[PDB]
Structure 1
């Protein structure tokens, strides 16, 4: 199941972590702060990220992706699959 959900950066970030693996493509959610923004928007560990702000990052470096995430200010909107 896919989830499109927009997150609004909280007292501590969006309250989650990006994680990638070392020469696998793709970037995924791992640590979701209970009650944090990512959590309330429905995200769950290991949800795989597909679009950031409408852009597909599947073929993009973990670095590039983290950066695109921070580059959106108060908000970032994510399409994931889990």
Structure 2
């Protein structure tokens, strides 16, 4: 119900969350926010829906493309989510 805009700096062990999808439901949401990790500190929470990765709307994109986009921006990634 609330949109959050945030910027993650990759840590020793990634951004500190996983993407889950549901099987042909569209959209990608956050799954396993590591306590104290980048995503955690940046305000993200489980079941937050990804709307934009680095300014690009990814709602009409397969879970796999969304994963790729995130793991393709290097040290940083900017996310617009809704939760």
Shared fold by TM > 0.5? yes
More strand by percentage: 1
Moved over 3 A (4+): none
Q: CA RMSD in A?
A: 0.4
Deviations 1:26-57 (A, max 9, x none): 00001100000000000000000000000000
**How many angstroms does 1:2 deviate by?**
0.5
Deviations 1:2-30 (A, max 9, x none): 00000000011001000101110000001
Please, what TM-score do these two structures have when normalized by structure 2? Answer: 0.97
Residue 55 (structure 2) aligns with? 54
Give the unaligned 5+ runs of structure 2.
none
Equivalenced residues, count: 82
Write the distance in 2 (CA, Å) between the matches of 1:70 and 1:23: 21
Please, what TM-score do these two structures have when normalized by structure 1? Answer: 0.99
